Every structure is written in structure tokens, then in C-alpha cells.
């Protein structure tokens, strides 16, 4: 059991070929999950499953610069299930973050924040029990 919200330092920032794996279980009656890859106060990549946005389940991705959110990218494929265990993998590629859930590709997010070495912290929050959060190089 790790405590949420959880902050995973990414020493030296992210680099292509870095793979981040997050294991946990979605709570009963979850409303949201969030991963926030941060560059200081900015959020380079916000990954936000929403379980009930106007009775729809959607994933919202965005970037926050100077305290302002940008243009949302939305995905209607929704692989999370209330009460059930999940695995999120985030692979950093040269031009985008690639996200897979439960070993199935979900989405890509093109890099808006381009100083990858300065994205040095991952925040994990929301309605989950967090089992493991780690990284490796592939």
C-alpha cells in the first residue's frame, strides 16, 4: 500500500525509452484518476480518466502552462473499471507519451512541453489504491 497522492521523482527528467509502470486498483465508486507529469508548477502531461462526466466515461489529456489549461484531447475508449485492478504503462517516445492500459495501447500525447529533461516529477492522485509505481529503461 502506497499513499495517494503519491509523488514519484523522475531523476534527471524523462527521456525517450523510459517506461513508467503504475499498478493499482480503482476504488468503488471512483470519480477520477490523474497522472500529472510536472515541470515545476507546469503540468507537461495530465492524464485524467473521468468516470462520470455527464453520465459518460472519458479520458481527458491536457497541459497546464503558467496556471492555464490548454486545449483538451479526449479519448472515449475507457479501459478502467470501478473496483478492479489495472496497470498503466507510460512509454516516453521522442515525439509523444504513449499510454497502454492492461497491456493494450490506449493513446499517444504529442509533446507540448519540449524540455523533456525538466519534466522531473510524476504525481499520482485520485480514487485508487496504489500498489506500485516504478520506472525502467527499455
Curated annotation (Swiss-Prot):
Membrane-crossing residue ranges in chain numbering: none
Subcellular compartments: Cytoplasm; Nucleus; Secreted
Tissue expression remark: A major expression is found in the colonic epithelium. It is also abundant in the activated macrophages. Expressed in fetal membranes.
Main location: cytoplasm
Domain Galectin: 6-136
Function: Galactose-specific lectin which binds IgE. May mediate with the alpha-3, beta-1 integrin the stimulation by CSPG4 of endothelial cells migration. Together with DMBT1, required for terminal differentiation of columnar epithelial cells during early embryogenesis. In the nucleus: acts as a pre-mRNA splicing factor. Involved in acute inflammatory responses including neutrophil activation and adhesion, chemoattraction of monocytes macrophages, opsonization of apoptotic neutrophils, and activation of mast cells.
UniProt-recorded name of the protein: Galectin-3
Gene that this sequence comes from: LGALS3
Covered residues, full protein: 113 to 250 of 250
Amino acid at each position: 500500500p502506497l499513499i495517494v497522492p503519491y509523488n514519484l521523482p523522475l531523476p534527471g527528467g524523462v527521456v525517450p525509452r523510459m517506461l513508467i509502470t503504475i499498478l493499482g486498483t480503482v476504488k468503488p465508486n471512483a470519480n477520477r484518476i490523474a497522472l500529472d507529469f510536472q515541470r515545476g508548477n507546469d503540468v507537461a502531461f495530465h492524464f485524467n480518466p473521468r468516470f462520470n462526466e455527464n453520465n459518460r466515461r472519458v479520458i481527458v489529456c491536457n497541459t497546464k502552462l503558467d496556471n492555464n489549461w490548454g486545449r483538451e484531447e479526449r479519448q472515449s475508449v475507457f479501459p478502467f473499471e470501478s473496483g478492479k485492478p489495472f496497470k498503466i504503462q507510460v512509454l516516453v517516445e521522442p515525439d509523444h507519451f504513449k499510454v497502454a492500459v492492461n497491456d493494450a495501447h490506449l493513446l499517444q500525447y504529442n509533446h507540448r512541453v519540449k524540455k523533456l529533461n525538466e519534466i522531473s516529477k510524476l504525481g499520482i492522485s485520485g480514487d485508487i489504491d496504489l500498489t506500485s509505481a516504478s520506472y525502467t529503461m527499455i
